[PDB]
Protein: Putative 2-C-methyl-D-erythritol 4-phosphate cytidylyltransferase 2
Amino acid sequence: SLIYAQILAGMGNVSMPKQFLPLNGKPIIVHTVEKFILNTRFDKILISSPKEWMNHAEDNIKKYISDDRIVVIEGGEDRNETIMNGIRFVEKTYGLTDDDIIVTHDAVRPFLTHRIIEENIDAALETGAVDTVIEALDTIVESSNHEVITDIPVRDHMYQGQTPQSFNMKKVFNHYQNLTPEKKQILTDACKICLLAGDDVKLVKGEIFNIKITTPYDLKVANAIIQERI
Amino acid sequence: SLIYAQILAGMNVSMPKQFLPLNGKPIIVHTVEKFILNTRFDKILISSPKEWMNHAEDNIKKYISDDRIVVIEGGEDRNETIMNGIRFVEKTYGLTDDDIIVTHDAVRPFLTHRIIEENIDAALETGAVDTVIEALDTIVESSNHEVITDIPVRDHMYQGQTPQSFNMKKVFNHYQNLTPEKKQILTDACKICLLAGDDVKLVKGEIFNIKITTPYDLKVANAIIQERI
Structure:
């Protein structure tokens, strides 16, 4: 029963990964990786990168963090395929068992807490599938035809998905591979795949500040958080 | 057909957040300014709790000299506050069957002219409109609050904003037809119209049409305002 982390993310497939952007003087990826290193229960912390950014990723992390369990690996096309490449890496290099769990997380979510990581580990050992969520900040409205409201579902039922998403490694690898070629394209969320196969996907409560840093909107939303903290 | 705006706030003792300054001036002023730039509004109602009415009236008037601003008394409920707006219009100006109201959060100062204009046009068409954006994140459903029950199709999922615009007589009638506890359950006025069989049209909002509540939300608003000048 070994515990693994996978840190991953992803204009016309050519733009620089946003996790390489500075945030208060240091790359977003470093802020994120620092959180995982402070957790002593991880055996390896995989950082997934597109082929052309691998060299930059490994040289950049090493100048800020000198932890031995950081390994930079090659990404896939889908977020799912990148996860599967992480499971295929662990198998080839370290070997897999039936109790090995992976905590997958967005490189551009640097504000996750120790609590979030710990609960994600514990819930992956229990049920083998976990999603990090917060109570929906806004009223969720459903529209099938995209012109009029078809439904406004009950408020306390509605949650907003964040990451980490943690899984039993063999379970999620098996569930994904059983899908048809068309169904791999549709099912982008790995937590939904486990849901549609009959696994219980437990919830871990996130934070309002556990934001994904993409847009220049999202970037200064992140700058709103970091300055008051010190 | 006369066109009205209603700008709404809400402890119970807290100072309304719309009175907080944003780049040197109250949040409510930023919001009211956008409605004043629309010339189709006949009256711009600003709702306030009874204890903050004097402050709201004096404060708005030192920044904005427009004649169609009137501060009125809010209710306990957002719906009741809306109903008080319709009751005020009926008493003071009179109601017709074609009269529409554009209701909007005081703490949403970043709505655009497009959002307001589309809200006016759609309320004249169908009599019920919601301002929405495509859900920024994956919406998960959980009935039991412990495990995922559903993850619905992404393209179906929207996040609610304001304005919410209505034919006045229609929404007043739809609310009044409800049972006592159904009024307590149904907080959303667009949901009431949906359940009564009206077509609630969608106007697309903006990612920056945020509600300024939390201290998180406050500097998110400070992120938006400095770059635009």
User: Anything to note?
Assistant: The first helix of chain B runs from residue 27 to 36.
